[PDB]
Amino acid sequence: MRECISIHVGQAGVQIGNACWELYCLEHGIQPDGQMSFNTFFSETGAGKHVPRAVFVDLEPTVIDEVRTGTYRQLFHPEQLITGKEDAANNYARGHYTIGKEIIDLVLDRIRKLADQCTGLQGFLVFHSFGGGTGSGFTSLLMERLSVDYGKKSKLEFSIYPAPQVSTAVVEPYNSILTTHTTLEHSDCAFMVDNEAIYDICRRNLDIERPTYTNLNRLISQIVSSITASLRFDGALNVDLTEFQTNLVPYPRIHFPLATYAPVISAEKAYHEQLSVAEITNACFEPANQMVKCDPRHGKYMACCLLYRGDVVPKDVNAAIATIKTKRTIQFVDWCPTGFKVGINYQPPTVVPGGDLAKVQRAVCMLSNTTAIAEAWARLDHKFDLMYAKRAFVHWYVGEGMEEGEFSEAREDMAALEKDYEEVGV
Amino acid sequence: ADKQMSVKEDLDKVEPAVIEAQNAVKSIKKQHLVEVRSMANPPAAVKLALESIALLLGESTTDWKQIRSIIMRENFIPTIVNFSAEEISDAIREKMKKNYMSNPSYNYEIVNRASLAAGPMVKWAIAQLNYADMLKRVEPLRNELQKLE
Amino acid sequence: MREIVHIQAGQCGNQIGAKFWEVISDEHGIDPTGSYHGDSDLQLERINVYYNEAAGNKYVPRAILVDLEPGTMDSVRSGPFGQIFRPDNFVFGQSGAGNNWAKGHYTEGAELVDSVLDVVRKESESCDCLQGFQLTHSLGGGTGSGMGTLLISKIREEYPDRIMNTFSVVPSPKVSDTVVEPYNATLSVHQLVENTDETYCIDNEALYDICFRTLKLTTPTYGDLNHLVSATMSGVTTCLRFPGQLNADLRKLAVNMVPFPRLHFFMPGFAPLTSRGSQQYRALTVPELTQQMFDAKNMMAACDPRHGRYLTVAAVFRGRMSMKEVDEQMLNVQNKNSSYFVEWIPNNVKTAVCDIPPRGLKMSATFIGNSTAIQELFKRISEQFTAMFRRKAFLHWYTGEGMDEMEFTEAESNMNDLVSEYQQYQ
Ligand SMILES: CC(=O)O[C@H]1C(=O)[C@@]2(C)[C@H]([C@H](OC(=O)c3ccccc3)[C@]3(O)C[C@H](OC(=O)[C@H](O)[C@@H](NC(=O)c4ccccc4)c4ccccc4)C(C)=C1C3(C)C)[C@]1(OC(C)=O)CO[C@@H]1C[C@@H]2O
Ligand SMILES: Nc1nc2c(ncn2[C@@H]2O[C@H](COP(=O)(O)OP(=O)(O)OP(=O)(O)O)[C@@H](O)[C@H]2O)c(=O)[nH]1
Ligand SMILES: Nc1nc2c(ncn2[C@@H]2O[C@H](COP(=O)(O)OP(=O)(O)O)[C@@H](O)[C@H]2O)c(=O)[nH]1
Ligand SMILES: [Mg+2]
């Protein structure tokens, strides 16, 4: 079978992971115990127990220690959960050059073992953060190694991007840029979600006034379930990981699709609602519902994909799409007329006990590229330029096996990227 | 009297070199020194750049854990101020010439790329190992000031 | 992993340390006998950082106690929590430094250092993986300044890759306690600037302000002042010792807090700072805590923050809260005090959310600010010192111990260097 590999890197990655493996289990029908074709995300053990086909890495042992004591604990064989000595401490030069070039080799080992299991290894998913220390250098390093090993294999990147406003960490801007330098030339596709937009979605659509990391994460994870379920499940028009890459990368360089997972509807909002197929399409295209702090109207959707689930019938979808094409507001690129692929899967999303969402019969994760993400790039370039004018926090990185020139080249790359998007828009 | 000024030309032809080499002393930031003092696992380029000045003072140790001690000490700053290669031995300078004429780090491009923390000091180290050359410019003609003068 | 080696030097260091240990002990469920009687498994999850276990559930702080006199450290022993130390950890001589830097550094303390360093070396080797060294040592005394500084230097030579943090209690110009406080501070600072990664500067003045105004204790016991600083340090290190939604390593804090090699000095605060029975009026919320922290009355440093701008900020919260709330709350804050946040660095503030409250407050917070304003503290001491040096005053005590005028001049240069750099980044 088509079968996959998970790699959670950094605190964010693992925290996202904790949410993810809950979901999959609830869907495939696996208990936390591992007891009960899920081949893609669960590899069956000798008898009864199923083992997640995952890798869990962090330099900060704090995080994965929480994993080892949670109810989701016995689900994973502790072959997976790797530990490092000391945290990357929001240094890219510790994630890459120092603590990375130590524990990386152990991780490469676990990866290889897991790869051996897979008959048909489809590809990889890399939950990291552009803007944690771990996931900024280490992720890049890991990616590099995997590219050298496999090359042809599918690689995917659920990247917690810096929110232009919201604040976690002072050096956050430097990390992103170093990551981008290295990431973009490995990962064939990169779905990037910033937390602020997710928070917006939490407050407005679900009426939740206390958005915890947990809730914000469940939403992110439901984005990934839809992307998979085409692999994981039966149905007309089934999409593959390779299909996205092929669909949603108009030029081989630019591959940064945004993601929106509608409906995002609470226990109340279930009633006062009827949840039609075409309702949910409109919702997806909503400027507010984007899982980035980007307005899609400030450019042109280059090429879009929609992954309907549950009780979705094709024509209905096809009519909604007609409507969408009709609206001249929602700008498309001149040069490719039909900018959709539709995948319809008989499996509906199944929602986590004690969570945000209620049973939505129909749902859709729209993974849409736009030239409009060029706005979030520019912002970040600016933040970095401002701090690199003073050369602040320079000392930390340099003394950890880095180049000052690497900072300059990274910006150059960003300029090139921005230029490319401009070209495409024209 | 014609040769009396040719032996006095040597201090004049090294005058642009000496002045610029001692201008690399003045072009020293206090913050840039301690960046090296706060650096624990440096680029291999900046590591060699301090090995350049390590044996200039006369420390044969090459480990970074052990060489950061000379950098760490407070003796390190005033010694860079008053420093002259005129009094620096030829033999040790020869070691400074042999090792550092092979360096990628001696190329003013590698250091600058690595860091601007090591930038002006390699710019000093090129000037200061070329102050050794100024010593090797003046001294093979100083003998002319001892016998021919 | 990531264990910390505590140090207490001088009456002041020894006393804050005394109260500090008591405080951490309560937080981790350890009673006076070195036995664990706590109901929270999370306490013993990461007891490591701050304690060694021995036979029969024996517990023992990795703390070294230093005093050039026996008296203050013998009081320690008599104390209730004093008998938790392994008595081999009290290293003392019987000649008092008598508020002489030269006695501490050069003479009396040079005799007692080697023995102390041996105890240091015991501790480092007994670590699974040494993270850092916390030194609580006054700046203005004899045993804190000279002896403390000497201890820091040698320790840095021994373990240069590790964290050195010092909760250094500084002179208050308005309530001077000692004659040559200027001399002690100036000589100490010149060394400290170059020998530590981060130093939390706490003056008695500010503590009094807190006690008098807010806690409404118009009879401050040194106990009370100490209780304050103790909580500060606990908060700093909560992340290492307890699981969190976002976890800030000591290195993480340093990296996030420090624009340049030099300017590592900080002002800690704490909230909620309230009197008994002045809390029923309040209600514990993220906004409440932030407002308290960013108020001048809740600063444990000399400088008024508004006489300058915070270069960076790191608010390490505790207890169970919405990341979103904190994020959104501290965004408002950045905006309001536009004048008192430095431009260089966008995302000035750095939030870290430990998941553990401090055993009796439903929520709590700990501030760490790096303000240009703290230049004023250095100015005050520089001025005080300079005038007395003009008359070559008290000189004979120091010249007697081998120290020289040029040294003092160089110490003045250090002070001048520190204040100019802050001015530049105003
Ligand atoms: C019901 C209730 O709210 O009780 C509080 C309380 O009333 C107040 C006044 C407490 C009280 O604090 C003080 O009296 C105090 C005096 C001087 C300096 C600092 C504190 C409290 O005494 C202090 C005490 O603190 C703790 O229990 C924490 O664990 C604290 N450690 C200790 O107090 C402690 C005492 C003896 C031995 C070992 C530990 C702590 C705080 C931060 C980090 C680590 C530990 C607490 C919650 C309270 C009382 C009892 C009234 C406050 O402080 C703390 C630390 O909670 C003062 O500011 C808060 C606001 C609280 O409302
Ligand atoms: N969605 C989500 N994002 C998180 C979470 N924790 C941190 N982040 C994001 O991750 C970045 C902060 O750094 P972390 O990811 O915590 O750092 P790390 O990768 O663990 O690196 P180190 O802490 O140095 O080990 C910011 O983008 C945070 O918003 C979480 O639980 N959920
Ligand atoms: N916060 C606090 N400060 C103290 C305490 N005891 C003394 N100090 C301060 O320490 C300073 C003098 O230094 P000290 O360390 O006593 O000198 P030593 O005894 O020779 O080390 C004075 O300014 C006191 O205010 C205490 O218990 N708490
Ligand atoms: Mg982490």
CATH label of the domain that carries residue A21: 3.40.50.1440
Is residue A366 within 8 A of residue A284, CB to CB? The reply is yes
Does the Cβ of C298 fall within 6 Å of ligand 1?
no
The domain in which residue B10 lies consists of: 2-142
C376-425: CATH number: 1.10.287.600
Interatomic CA distance for residues B63 and B61, integer angstroms: 6
Q: What's the burial of B116, exposed, middle or buried (CB within 10 Å: 0-12/13-18/19+)?
A: middle
CA distance C363 to C360: 9
Shared domain check, A43 and A91: yes
Domain boundary, last residue among A233, A257, A281 = A257
Beta bridge partners of A44: A50
* CB A155, CB A121: distance < 8 Å: no
DSSP C401: T
Q: Which residue has the tokens 């495409």?
A: A424
Render the burial of C354-380: b for 16+ CB within 10 Å, e for the rest.
Answer: bbbbbeebebbbbbbbbbbbbbbbbbb
The strand pairing partners of A369, in sequence order, are: A303
- CA–CA distance, B71 with C269 (Å, rounded to integer): 35
Phi, psi of A262, rounded to the nearest 5 degrees: -95, 165
Domain final residue, candidates A356, A372, A388: A372
Contact A393 C257 (CB under 8 A): no
List phi, psi (to 5°) of C272.
-90, 125
3-class DSSP state of A153: coil
Distance, in Å, from the CA atom of B97 to the CA atom of B125, rounded to the nearest integer, reads: 11
Local structure of C52: helix, strand or coil: strand
Domain boundary among A257, A281, A308: A257
CATH number of domain containing B104: 1.20.920.60
Q: Are B79 and B66 in contact (CB under 8 A)?
A: no
In this structure, are residues A178 and A409 in contact, taking their beta carbons and an 8 Å threshold?
no
C-alpha span between B6 and A415 (Å, rounded): 57
Are A71 and A33 found together in one domain? yes
Which method, experimentally, gave rise to this model? cryo-EM
Are A177 and A57 within one domain?
A: yes
DSSP-assigned letter for residue C128: S
Q: How far apart are CA C347 and CA C311, in angstroms?
A: 11
Q: Tell me the backbone φ, ψ of residue C191, rounded to 5 degrees.
A: -80, -45
Tokens 């240094």 belong to A91
> Per 3-state DSSP, what percentage of chain B is helix, strand, and coil (rounded to 5)?
65, 0, 35
Q: Is residue B148 part of a domain?
A: no
Annotated binding site of C for GTP: 11, 69, 138, 142-144, 204, 226
Angle at A50 between CA A49 and CA A53, to 5 degrees: 150
Ligand 1 centre to CA of C216 (Å) is 14
Omega before residue C61 within 30° of 0, cis: no
Integer Cα distance of C36 and C48 in angstroms:
13
Asked if A58 and A194 sit in the same domain, the reply is: yes
Q: How far is the CA of A95 from the centre of ligand 4 (A)?
A: 11
Distance (Å) from CA C100 to ligand 3 centroid: 13
The amino acid present at A320, given as its one-letter code, is: A
**Tokens 């900018």 belong to which residue?**
A339
Domain tally, chain A: 3
- Specify the CATH number for the domain of residue A342: 3.30.1330.20
Where in chain C is CATH 3.40.50.1440?
Answer: 3-257
- The residues, ordered by sequence, that sit 6+ positions from A117 with a Cβ below 8 Å of its Cβ are A3, A43, A53
Residue A137 and residue A144: Cα distance in Å, rounded? Answer: 11
Q: Are residues A274 and A382 in the same domain?
A: no
Residue B63 near chain C (CB below 8 Å)? no
> Where, residue-wise, is CATH 3.30.1330.20 in chain C?
265-375
CA C227 from centroid of its chain's CA atoms: 13
H or E stretch at A341: strand A340-345
Cα–Cα dist A283/B69, whole Å: 63
Residue B76 counted as domain residue = yes
Contacts of A213 (CB under 8 A, 6+ apart): A15, C245, C323
From the list A394, A401, A403, the residue facing B41 with the nearest CB is A401
Sheet bearing A258-262, strands edge to edge: A258-262, A362-370, A301-310, A340-345
Spatial separation of the C-alpha atoms in residues A242 and B40, rounded to whole Å:
43
Sign of the Cα pseudo-torsion (C5, C9, C14, C20, in order): negative
Alpha helices in A30-167 (DSSP H): 61-67, 92-93, 100-117, 139-149
Distance, CA of C56 to CA of C39 (rounded, Å) = 18
Q: Which residues pair with C363 in a beta bridge?
A: C319
Give the environment of ion ligand 4: residues with CB less than 5 A. A 11, 60
Are residues A244 and A333 located together in one domain of the fold? no
Neighbours of A378 (CB within 10 A): 13
Based on the fold, state whether residues A6 and A61 are members of the same structural domain: yes
Q: Are residues A224 and A85 in the same domain?
A: yes
Total residue count of chain C as it appears in this document: 426
Residue with tokens 């055993």: C359
In a domain, B149, yes or no: no
What is the rounded CA–CA span in Å between residue A248 and residue A333?
A: 13
Helix axes C405-424, C181-195, angle to 10 degrees: 60
Put simply, the chain B residues between 17 and 76 with a CB less than 8 A from any chain A CB are 35-36, 38-43, 46
- Identify which of C11, C73, C210, C397 to mutate to test ligand 3's pocket (most ligand atoms within 8 A of the CB): C11
Calpha distance A118→C192 (Å, rounded): 57
CB atoms within 10 A of CB A383: 20
- Fold topology of C265-375: 60s Ribosomal Protein L30; Chain: A; (3.30.1330)
| Rounded Cα–Cα distance for residues C137 and C134 (Å) | 9
Task: List CB contacts (< 8 A) between B36 and chain A.
Answer: 399
- φ/ψ of C38, rounded to 5, equals -115, 150
- Resolution for this PDB entry, in angstroms: 4.1
- As for how many domains chain B has, the answer is 1
The CA radius of gyration of chain A, in Å to the nearest whole number, is 21
Q: Please report residues of C whose CB lies closer than 8 A to that of A213.
A: 245, 323
Query: How many whole angstroms separate alpha carbon A351 and alpha carbon A359?
Result: 6
- Residue A384: domain span: 373-426
Given CB atoms, is B35 within the 8 Å cutoff of chain C? yes
Q: Give the class (CATH, top level) of C3-257.
A: alpha beta
